[PDB]
Amino acid sequence: AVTPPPEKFNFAEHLLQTNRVRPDKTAFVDDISSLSFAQLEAQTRQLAAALRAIGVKREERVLLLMLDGTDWPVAFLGAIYAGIVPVAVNTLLTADDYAYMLEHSRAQAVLVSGALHPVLKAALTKSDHEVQRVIVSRPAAPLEPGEVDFAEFVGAHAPLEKPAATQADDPAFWLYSSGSTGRPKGVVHTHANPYWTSELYGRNTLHLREDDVCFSAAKLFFAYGLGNALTFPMTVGATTLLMGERPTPDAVFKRWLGGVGGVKPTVFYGAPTGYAGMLAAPNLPSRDQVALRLASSAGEALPAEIGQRFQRHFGLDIVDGIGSTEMLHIFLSNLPDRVRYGTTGWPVPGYQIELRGDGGGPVADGEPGDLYIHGPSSATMYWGNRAKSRDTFQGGWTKSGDKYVRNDDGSYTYAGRTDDMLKVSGIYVSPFEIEATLVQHPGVLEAAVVGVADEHGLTKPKAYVVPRPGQTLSETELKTFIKDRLAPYKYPRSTVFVAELPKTATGKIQRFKLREGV
Numbered sequence: 001a002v003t004p005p006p007e008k009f010n011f012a013e014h015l016l017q018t019n020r021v022r023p024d025k026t027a028f029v030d031d032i033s034s035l036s037f038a039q040l041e042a043q044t045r046q047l048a049a050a051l052r053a054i055g056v057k058r059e060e061r062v063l064l065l066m067l068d069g070t071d072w073p074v075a076f077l078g079a080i081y082a083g084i085v086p087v088a089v090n091t092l093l094t095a096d097d098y099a100y101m102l103e104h105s106r107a108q109a110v111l112v113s114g115a116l117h118p119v120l121k122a123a124l125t126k127s128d129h130e131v132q133r134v135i136v137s138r139p140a141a142p143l144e145p146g147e148v149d150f151a152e153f154v155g156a157h158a159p160l161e162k163p164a165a166t167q168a169d170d171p172a173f174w175l176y177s178s179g180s181t182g183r184p185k186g187v188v189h190t191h192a193n194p195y196w197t198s199e200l201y202g203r204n205t206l207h208l209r210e211d212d213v214c215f216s217a218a219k220l221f222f223a224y225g226l227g228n229a230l231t232f233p234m235t236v237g238a239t240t241l242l243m244g245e246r247p248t249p250d251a252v253f254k255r256w257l258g259g260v261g262g263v264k265p266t267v268f269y270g271a272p273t274g275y276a277g278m279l280a281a282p283n284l285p286s287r288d289q290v291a292l293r294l295a296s297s298a299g300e301a302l303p304a305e306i307g308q309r310f311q312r313h314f315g316l317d318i319v320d321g322i323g324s325t326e327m328l329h330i331f332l333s334n335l336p337d338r339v340r341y342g343t344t345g346w347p348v349p350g351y352q353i354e355l356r357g358d359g360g361g362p363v364a365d366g367e368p369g370d371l372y373i374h375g376p377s378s379a380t381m382y383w384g385n386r387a388k389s390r391d392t393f394q395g396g397w398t399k400s401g402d403k404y405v406r407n408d409d410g411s412y413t414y415a416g417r418t419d420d421m422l423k424v425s426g427i428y429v430s431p432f433e434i435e436a437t438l439v440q441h442p443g444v445l446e447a448a449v450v451g452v453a454d455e456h457g458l459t460k461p462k463a464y465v466v467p468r469p470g471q472t473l474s475e476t477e478l479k480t481f482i483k484d485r486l487a488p489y490k491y492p493r494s495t496v497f498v499a500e501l502p503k504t505a506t507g508k509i510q511r512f513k514l515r516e517g518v
C-alpha cells in the first residue's frame with residue numbers, strides 16, 4: 001500500500017518538500033520559540049551550509065547532543081540535507097560515554113545544548129576526537145575560543161542551494177544502542193528507513209494528520225521519540241510541541257492544557273511508567289479539559305490495568321506497540337480502534353514477525369519464542385562491529401532480544417528478554433552496570449541486581465547486597481552513594497541486604513533464584 005522511496009532520495013529534502021504546501025503552519029514550538037515550516041526550511045538549509053563551510057564533508061558524522069526544542073530538528077535535518085550523518089544521542093549519559101561516542105563516530109563537529117556543554121567539555125578533554133567545531137544551542141556559559149553560538153552560526157550562512165544527492169540506502173543518521181556489557185553500538189540508519197516508519201506506522205497505523213498537534217514525552221533522541229515528534233508529524237504536516245525539561249506528570253499536564261504555544265496536543269506519546277505516574281497524580285485533568293484523540297505507548301510492555309484505568313478515566317485507549325533502535329520504530333502494535341490489553345497487538349502491515357525456539361525452528365502457538373523482525377526500516381549494521389552485526393542482522397531478519405507468545409487471535413504477548421537487560425521506562429538498563437557500581441562502595445562485598453515488578457506491574461531494578469563484615473553500611477548510606485554514582489534512570493527501586501547470594505561452583509550468581517524470591 002506504500003510505494004518505496006526512489007533510489008535517489010534525501011530524507012531531509014523529502015520532509016521539506018512535503019511541507020512546501022504549508023509554509024506558514026507551525027512545524028515546531030517549544031517554551032521560548034516557534035518555527036513555521038518555511039522558517040524550519042530556511043534554518044535547516046542555512047545550517048546545512050554552515051556545516052559544509054566549516055569543512056564537514058558528505059558521509060562524515062557530527063554528534064547531536066541536544067535537549068528537545070526547535071533547534072533540534074534544524075540540527076538533525078540540516079546535517080541530513082547536507083549528506084552529513086548526525087549521531088543523535090541520549091542527553092543523560094556521562095562524559096565517558098560521550099568520549100567513546102566522539103571517538104567511535106569520528107564526529108567532526110558537535111551540536112550541543114548549552115545545558116549539556118559541561119559534560120561535552122569533559123568528553124572533549126579526555127578523548128582522542130576529531131571535533132573541528134562545537135556549535136552551542138542556547139549557551140548557558142561563555143563560549144570558549146573557537147566555539148560558536150548556534151543561532152549565529154545558522155544566521156551567518158546563506159541556505160544551501162540543493163540537498164546532497166544521496167541514495168535511499170545511504171546512511172542518513174546513527175542512534176546508539178547499549179547491551180548488558182560493553183560499549184554502546186552505533187546503529188546505522190538509511191535515508192529510506194524513516195520514510196518507511198513514518199508511512200507504515202505514523203500514517204498508515206496511527207493515521208496522524210495535518211491538523212494534529214503532537215507531543216511526545218519520549219525525547220527526540222529516542223528512536224520512539226524521533227518518529228513521534230519529528231518524522232511522523234513532518235510526514236503529514238502536523239504541528240509538534242517540544243519540551244526541554246524532564247517529563248513529569250505536571251509538566252505534561254501543563255502542555256495537555258494548552259499552557260505552551262497556544263496549542264493543545266491531540267496526540268500524546270510516552271512510556272507506561274509515565275502513564276502510571278499521571279494516573280496516580282491528584283490533578284490528572286478530566287477528558288473535557290484536553291484535546292487528546294490518540295494516546296501512544298512504547299518503551300516497556302503496557303500493564304493491562306494501566307490501559308484499563310486510562311480508558312475508564314479518559315474514554316480513550318492507550319495504544320501500546322513495541323519497536324526498537326535497530327528497527328527504528330514500532331513493528332508490532334495495537335491499533336487505535338483495536339486494543340487488547342495484556343498484549344502488544346498484531347504485526348504492523350509491512351513488517352513480518354517470527355518466533356524462533358532454541359534451534360531456530362517454529363514454536364507452537366502459546367509457547368514463547370525469540371522475536372525476529374523482517375521489515376524495510378531495519379538498520380544495516382552496527383558501525384565497526386561485525387560480530388554483533390552478524391548476531392543481530394541475519395539475512396533480512398533482525399533479532400530483537402525480546403521473547404513473545406502468539407495468541408489464538410494472532411496477537412503477541414510479551415514473554416521476557418533474552419539478554420539480562422531491563423527495560424525501565426523506555427531506556428535499557430544493565431543489571432551488571434549497577435552491580436559493578438554497588439561493589440565500589442567499601443562496605444559492599446557482593447551485589448546482584450534483577451528486575452522486579454512494582455505495584456503497577458512495571459519492571460524496575462532491585463539490588464541484593466551482601467555487606468562486608470568489617471564495616472557499618474546502612475541503607476541510607478547506600479542510597480547516598482547510588483545518588484552520587486548513577487543516573488536516576490538507573491536507580492534500583494529497592495536494595496535488600498542478605499547474608500549470602502545463591503551461586504554455582506564457579507561463583508556465577510544464580511540470578512534466577514533471586515527472581516523467584518528465595
Ligand SMILES: O=C(O)c1ccco1
Pocket residue numbers: 223224225298299300321322323324325328329330426
Ligand atoms: O518500543 C520501543 O522501545 C520503541 C518504539 C519505537 C522505537 O523504539
